[PDB]
Design an enzyme around this catalytic site. Structure first.
Site, PDB file in Angstrom:
ATOM      1  N   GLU A 131       0.403  -8.275  -9.488  1.00 14.03           N
ATOM      2  CA  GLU A 131       1.121  -8.419  -8.144  1.00 14.03           C
ATOM      3  C   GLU A 131       1.388  -9.608  -7.910  1.00 14.03           C
ATOM      4  OE1 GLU A 131      -0.624  -6.048  -4.750  1.00 14.03           O
ATOM      5  OE2 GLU A 131       0.055  -7.979  -3.808  1.00 14.03           O
ATOM      6  N   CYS A 179       1.441 -10.147   1.103  1.00 10.38           N
ATOM      7  CA  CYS A 179       2.455 -10.083   0.101  1.00 10.38           C
ATOM      8  C   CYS A 179       3.348  -8.989   0.535  1.00 10.38           C
ATOM      9  CB  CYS A 179       1.813  -9.415  -1.165  1.00 10.38           C
ATOM     10  SG  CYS A 179       1.011 -11.082  -2.000  1.00 10.38           S
TER      11      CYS A 179
END
Ligand SMILES: Cc1cc2nc3c(=O)[nH]c(=O)nc-3n(C[C@H](O)[C@H](O)[C@H](O)COP(=O)(O)OP(=O)(O)OC[C@H]3O[C@@H](n4cnc5c(N)ncnc54)[C@H](O)[C@@H]3O)c2cc1C
Ligand SMILES: Cc1cc2nc3c(=O)[nH]c(=O)nc-3n(C[C@H](O)[C@H](O)[C@H](O)COP(=O)(O)OP(=O)(O)OC[C@H]3O[C@@H](n4cnc5c(N)ncnc54)[C@H](O)[C@@H]3O)c2cc1C
Ligand SMILES: [K+]
Ligand SMILES: [K+]
Lengths: 969, 941
Positions: free
Chosen positions: B698, B732
């Site tokens: 990720e 994020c």
């Protein structure tokens, strides 16, 4: 007819009354046999374990094997060993008149003293070698020689006149039965003519000796697979000896084909002005035929309501008796209804007694037998002799026959007799029971496509025809297909027949980097509209492509026969697998295509769903040139990606079939693009391209690993990290445990290693055989190998043929030379002279895990034989390569099978069958280690690899108010 | 049943004395339709359904759409006029002059009045001041008027008073309108901010001897509001005209009421209580269920009708100390109060009745003729926006309760998954817990944290101090660093442990995760306090990190149980195919600092529960939080070698770990640059390497929230502020681009910047601060240079102060004028720098939203179904949020992860995740022996 049926019922009632209280010896509970059968009829689980234990028993040669199998199946020592051995031998001795020819003749004569005739059989079927077939043939010749010397001293069985030298005054005293599949180890309707000729030639040698002593030969009927072959042997032998009356054939009433087969045969006899003899039976292989059909995707050839078999028997017996002048009749049944029917139909038709007799199996239905002797006088026993292992198939059929729920004998003697129900006209029973017997997106659930069935004359005729038609279509130039249009280039590569490379099938245009770039751009331009196309609509395109292929099934198969040297069955299975992928992945997209609500918190809605990635490069192998090509391309397509497809350079015509099928389906322009090209010109280009988001590759490890490295780089403008779907080959072992059924293991290993000349990622290239059964297995494996022929795949008599091209032949031959130095040659076949990329069927022994041919993928007909000391070493050796794609084990030990399921860590492990031939849904295919990245084609996790998940979360509470949804907390 | 019969009769006396939803939706959104184009588009959309609409509406909608903005002017004139007229039935005016005039027509009709300001939610200090000054302005206008006011008819007392005893000027004030950051997370600061403004209003009220009543809002602020009332009362003990609202629908109310009466008596003061039922029932129940908090309200309506009568009685009993206002439109409720007072001989100067100004006039008057003293709740403010914001019946509710009360799944033996409850700062114990646990953590500083390999602690000579980013002089501990030798030892230990662990039953492996989860639950506040200090998590952020770690453990345990059973595939007889999963081998887990327990535990536990063994590298700045994984698996008794802890310098051991031939899987969460590098290096197959390495990656985002021109700004502004600046923007998932439609832009940006101005930057252990220091000195230097780049590219709108002195502080920074070509519209900054982008239309907004290389999260605020549907389809991110912030994904509810440059399409916390850590296998058995096979139930036969 009511009057006839009444007589039949009344006779049946008198028959039952006469045998009231008597039971067949087999059911006697004063003996082990009887108790075991009782327990088997009471408990299905025990029956399975018991019958399976009978099967494995002859391989239990040590005390350890015996005691362990007893514990595994059912959970001083010398004497206990003999107690158990004696018990199983008793079960076998129940149905046999002896173990040797001499013992059989002796018991045959004691049977005559009791008033019984006999038809003598040498136990054996499904032979594995020419040498074995010769032993079987010579056993009959030896029997006939012994019988020729005794029959003169035999007074003919009591009758109402005629010749006192003959049984009942008219029947030949010597009567033998022969099973055709014991006469040819490669009997197969796929090679219809060769099987007929091989069997006929041995049968003729036997028949000539029979005619020498004026005896009777009856040809047994075996599984449906060989039914047509066997009828043809009978017809041919009969016409060779048109005047000799004592030749018979078995017809099976349990076969749907039998009404027509019997009509055909009676008409045939009349047309040729000959007489025949038919032994009408119901049939011995019902459990097998039902399963075998469903497993191989063929139509079930037997009736599946038991009364249908009874009614057919009564129908067909009547037809035979009506035709008694040309057709002699042997009524072979243990059923009192059936027997009484035959007696009353014969009486009504006034059939002379010399035109019909009754038969029962030795060791069965003794009270029924006694009745027939009293009432009719003419009763013959089918008397087999031989050892337990060649007689194992027969023995198990008897165990099943006597204990089946639907068995007349079980219902008369193991249950409380319901005589009125047992004696019913079975046609009536059929009417009642037939009466009583009466997926999503609207689609019927998935089923694998029907496999070609060479029992059918039309399927056998189809291949030569379609192969010829293909040859009227050679010489064409195959263009690229880009953005819905045909694109020609100057660079052509001919595609040729590997079995005959002078034969050029066509010329293939090659894509340069420019054309591949054009294809990628077209795919990219088409992607947004295709991504936005309803999943169900995308699925519909695959279903249309499948129907288009279905319509062309034989034509598509014939192309593969010539372009890559597929055998007929291999070619057809390639096309049906492409069809299965289309049907299966259509349904999988429909399933995955609907968003799922996730979570159950109120005031909130979360939906989880899937979207495609972009442009997929699909790089396909030559070895399953339609199936794997279509599987990868259509999975990418149905999930919403657009595809740039590079077929292998040696199967580019087959690759063109994908163009034709998707074109007929009407797929939108740009969604599927066909860019055959030279890897040296455009291979890295295609993989490196910044607009590719997925690569689906099936090929060698070396190439797959190179793609994986190059694909990892993110180039400028590249939107995604590239997704890899890779299948990279195997070095697959089959283990032969010391209790393995070698009769099963040998043909499965031979097919696993040499099917399609060994050119499968799943192929067996290592057979790891336990020391204890090594010599026995290797002798049988080599002996069957020797009988097989190498040659052009268009000729169905050949087992395997040329490998794919000249480069493959040179590579395989070099490996064969390495292997010959590493081990010792056990078998190296002849090959045809002249052109063709022929590599011998090659078997090499003395191979160990350290050897190169025990480690490196040869992808050809080179089988390594590894001698393992025990099961633990077999497992360790099996796991000793860098690959882990498929594997197989032949074993009847639950403990060893469990150990294999846990420790033989391959992607597809097969127990007691070949390790090739994975079917969509049933065997999702693929592995890890150096064999792939854990993707399994034709399974329920595959489509997800071509997509990425998204979630949409909505706050549904507006002004302190939210609608309640049904699944809320 | 003496009173009951008397209540029924007081009530009988009284009793004689799809389109609709679309309409409501239209009025709601109407104030936002500031252009003809907006107006015609919403009419076209809202009333376009040919089937469900009256044909007049249906045909008009189509006409509105075809004319477009050309038809807007006539529609606006008609619709505005009608709605203003409608609003006039609920709101007493939008000018003080208009107010007074109707307040006087009200007096001249028999009604007293309480006045409340109806406006937009307070989102800034300026807005609080506008609200406050509006009260000051109404009081000045009322002062100058109540002299000339003839007191309402009565029976005794001052006739210059209402009813001879009630002040003529009565105002009600909403507490949270006085402070835009009112939050029990900062209890004391919220109390003081509100009190300071309530005090200024109150003095003006006391200057004209009027009545001030403090409204009660949602449960979140109840304890704050009660404390404000108290502090204010004690400041003016002798002034009797201060009132508080109490809500009968709260289970707390019985104790809250009793405590307040007691408190009063003890301090020798009088109080006034306006008892209501409660206005936030649906809100409270939904919020409680979303967070697994206790539901603060009764859920049987009668229970509230019964609690009211219970509580009104108790109040009336104590009338000498507690004045009472009955606020209900329920006849039974008013009747029952009336008689209870008259059955305890409460003087009438001790209770009055209150109803809505919007109540139908005949009902309003006919009720006056029975109750005598009716005060009208009279909302005041802008008409159009204001309207957007807007027998058995007489039975003893206690009977109704006893009756309705009376009338009233998981697998593997385990209860169904449910997210761990979020911390609830309405609880005194939860508020007390953080300062305590933070101090306890501070008694534990200065330890050396070793490697953990093969069940043993392993020390090395290389130590890295871990420090407090809000106070870097504060050293929390020293961390041992693994060299390549130690990482190799960890890999070898994992590999040696792997065969026995792979063979461990999936249910048993899941049991270890459940035990780790119970261990973490036992230490929730402690584990949270550590993150507050080590990485600068705010209290709620810290707690949510730990609860997410627990959720991964609970969820992945259940997922393995689900996935661990082989399934038969196909249905052919004489054959058994079983499809099942196996682990890969050794997993390298390389974790980020920003969710130091949650993401670490998620990747580690997923690998472990699926049968892999783990070598784990925490971030070098959150290695103590990394050590918590060691503690938790140790307490669960995980077998040796299955989990190994090897913090190390990436420069020293990073490539070595990724490159190692014994690694089969790499789970990474971090920056794109590092992730892509890992992906390239992992692709290579080295000698002795068993598998192609599986990548779980990720890699961050550049996430946009779109503000459509019809968005509800009261919701959008604070959600955007949180999405951008929660945890200093270090997520994020963070909003780093807010893409705002042209027609709403100036209003939106004014309110957003003014809200930002109200927030404070400082230490995250201080709950009053909105955000604090970024992760380390490198992040601070990097983020600050991006801010300078941004300020050159666009126009700085806001740059907050930061504390003087040490600490890695970056100002809360907002920059406008940003377009897709700009660097700060493209590059992940990972800090409190928000780019504001002005989009000319919705199509452009979507195109700009998709204009980066990332696609992790996104958000949209809109009340246009067509725009929302376009976003659902075209705003292609891994997690799209509609009408709320785009951060704070929960396990199961929001499986998290994206594609493009944001990841490889793995979604943590969802039902596809565990499969990425395994490979499938099939076993196929031929069951036919010698012509027969066992019949299976699932066979096609
Ligand atoms: C002397 C002799 C020789 C024989 N030779 C051969 C041979 O060469 N090849 C061969 O295949 N058979 C042969 N048979 C037949 C076979 O071995 C069995 O003995 C025979 O089928 C038993 O039938 P029945 O009338 O004795 O008993 P029954 O109990 O009346 O009949 C049982 C039979 O019904 C059939 N059946 C069972 N269940 C179903 C169902 N659900 N639906 C439809 N049909 C069903 C099967 O054929 C089964 O054997 C021979 C039999 C005898 C007596
Ligand atoms: C003058 C005045 C001032 C007000 N001030 C405030 C204020 O400062 N703060 C505040 O929170 N609201 C305030 N309200 C609103 C009040 O709390 C209620 O929302 C409303 O007045 C209740 O209406 P009721 O008694 O007329 O009718 P009803 O139909 O009797 O009452 C409805 C109420 O029952 C409750 N209820 C509904 N369903 C359930 C259920 N399933 N289980 C349990 N309870 C349920 C709700 O509270 C709902 O509001 C005020 C109302 C008036 C008239
Ligand atoms: K070719
Ligand atoms: K730190």
């Amino acid at each position: 007819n009511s009057e006839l049926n009444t007589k039949i019922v009344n006779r049946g009632k008198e028959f039952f009354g006469s045998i009231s209280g008597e039971k067949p010896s087999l059911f006697n509970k004063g003996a082990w046999m009887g108790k075991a059968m009782d327990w088997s009829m009471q408990n299905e689980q025990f029956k399975i374990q018991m019958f399976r234990f009978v099967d494995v028993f002859p391989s239990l040669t040590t005390s350890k094997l015996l005691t362990e199998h007893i514990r595994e199946y059912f959970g001083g020592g010398a004497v206990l060993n003999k107690v158990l051995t004696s018990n199983i031998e008793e079960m076998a001795r129940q149905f046999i008149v002896g173990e040797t020819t001499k013992e059989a003749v002796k018991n045959l004569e004691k049977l005559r003293k009791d008033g019984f005739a006999a038809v003598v059989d040498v136990l054996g079927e499904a032979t594995l070698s020419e040498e074995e077939a010769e032993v079987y043939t010579n056993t009959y010749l030896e029997l006939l020689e012994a019988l020729k010397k005794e029959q003169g001293s035999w007074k003919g069985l009591p009758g109402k006149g005629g010749d006192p030298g003959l049984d009942w005054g008219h029947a030949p005293k010597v009567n033998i039965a022969v099973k055709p599949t014991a006469l040819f180890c490669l009997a197969n309707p796929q090679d219809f003519e060769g099987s007929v000729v091989a069997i006929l030639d041995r049968m003729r040698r036997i028949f000539k000796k029979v005619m020498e002593l004026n005896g009777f030969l009856c040809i047994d009927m075996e599984s449906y697979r060989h039914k047509e072959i066997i009828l043809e042997v009978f017809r041919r032998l009969k016409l060779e000896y048109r005047d000799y009356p004592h030749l018979g054939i078995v017809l099976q009433a349990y076969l749907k084909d039998n009404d027509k087969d019997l009509d055909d045969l009676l008409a045939w006899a009349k047309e040729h002005k000959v007489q025949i003899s038919v032994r009408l039976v119901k049939g011995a292989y019902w459990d097998y035929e039902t399963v075998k059909a469903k497993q191989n995707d063929w139509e079930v050839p037997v009736w599946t309501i038991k009364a249908e078999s009874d009614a057919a028997y009564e129908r067909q017996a009547r037809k035979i008796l009506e035709n008694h002048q040309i057709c002699h009749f042997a009524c072979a049944s243990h059923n009192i209804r059936t027997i009484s029917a035959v007696m009353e139909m014969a009486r009504e038709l006034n059939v002379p007694e010399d035109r019909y007799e009754f038969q029962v199996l030795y060791g069965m239905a003794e009270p029924v037998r006694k009745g027939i002797l009293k009432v009719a006088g003419r009763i013959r026993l089918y008397a087999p002799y031989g050892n337990m292992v060649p007689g194992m198939g027969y023995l198990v059929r008897r165990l099943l026959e006597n204990t089946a729920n639907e068995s007349f004998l079980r219902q008369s003697f193991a249950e409380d007799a319901q005589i009125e129900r047992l004696l019913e006209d079975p046609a009536v029973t059929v009417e009642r029971e037939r009466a009583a017997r009466a997926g999503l997106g609207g689609l019927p659930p998935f089923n694998n496509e029907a496999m070609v069935d060479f029992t059918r004359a039309d399927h056998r005729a189809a291949f030569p025809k379609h192969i010829a038609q293909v040859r009227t279509q050679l010489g064409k130039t195959y263009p690229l297909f880009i953005n819905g249009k045909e694109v020609r280039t100057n660079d052509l590569i001919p595609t040729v027949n590997p079995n005959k490379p002078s034969e050029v099938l066509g010329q293939i245009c090659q894509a340069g980097t420019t054309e591949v770039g054009d294809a990628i751009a077209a795919a990219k331009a088409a992607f947004p509209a295709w991504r936005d196309t309803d999943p169900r609509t995308r699925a519909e395109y695959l279903l249309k492509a499948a129907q288009a292929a279905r319509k062309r099934l034989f034509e598509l198969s014939a192309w593969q026969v010539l372009e890559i040297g597929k055998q007929w069955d291999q070619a057809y299975a390639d096309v049906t697998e492409a069809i299965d992928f289309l049907e299966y992945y259509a349904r999988e997209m429909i399933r995955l295509g609907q968003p799922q609500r996730v979570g159950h918190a109120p005031g909130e809605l979360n939906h989880y769903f899937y979207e495609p990635k972009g442009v997929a490069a699909v790089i396909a192998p030559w070895n399953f040139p339609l199936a794997i090509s279509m599987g990868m391309a259509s999975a990418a397509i149905v999930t919403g990606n657009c595809v740039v497809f590079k077929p292998s350079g040696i199967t580019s015509i087959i690759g063109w079939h994908l163009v034709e099928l998707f074109r007929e389906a009407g797929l939108p322009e740009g969604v599927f693009n066909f860019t055959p090209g030279r890897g040296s010109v455009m291979g890295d280009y295609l993989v490196d391209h910044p607009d590719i988001s997925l690569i689906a590759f099936t090929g060698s490890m070396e190439t797959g690993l190179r793609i994986i490295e190059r694909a990892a780089k993110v180039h400028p403008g590249q939107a995604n990290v590239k997704k890899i779907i890779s299948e990279m080959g195997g070095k697959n072992a089959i283990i032969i445990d010391d209790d393995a059924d070698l009769d099963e293991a040998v043909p499965h290993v031979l097919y696993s290693a040499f099917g399609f000349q060994g050119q499968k990622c799943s192929a067996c290239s290592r057979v790891i055989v336990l020391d204890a059964v090594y010599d026995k297995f290797i002798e049988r494996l080599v002996s069957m190998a020797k009988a097989t022929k190498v040659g052009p795949s268009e000729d169905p008599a050949n087992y395997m043929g040329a490998v794919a091209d000249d480069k493959a032949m040179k590579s395989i031959k070099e490996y064969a030379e390495i292997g010959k130095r590493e081990g010792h040659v056990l078998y190296e076949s002849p090959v045809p002279a002249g052109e063709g990329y022929f590599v011998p069927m090659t078997i090499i022994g003395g191979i160990k895990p350290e050897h190169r041919i025990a480690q490196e993928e040869i992808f050809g007909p080179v089988l390594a034989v590894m001698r393992a000391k025990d099961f633990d070493q077999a497992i360790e050796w099996a796991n000793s390569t860098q690959f882990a794609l498929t594997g197989g084990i032949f074993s009847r030990s639950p403990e060893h099978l469990a150990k294999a399921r846990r420790e033989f860590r391959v992607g597809n492990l097969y127990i007691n069958r070949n390790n090739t031939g994975a079917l969509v849904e049933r065997q999702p295919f693929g592995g890890a280690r150096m064999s792939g990245v854990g993707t399994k084609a034709g399974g329920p996790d595959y489509l997800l690899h071509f997509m990425d998940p998204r979630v949409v979360t909505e706050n549904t509470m507006r002004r302190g108010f939210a609608p309640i949804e049904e699944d809320d907390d």
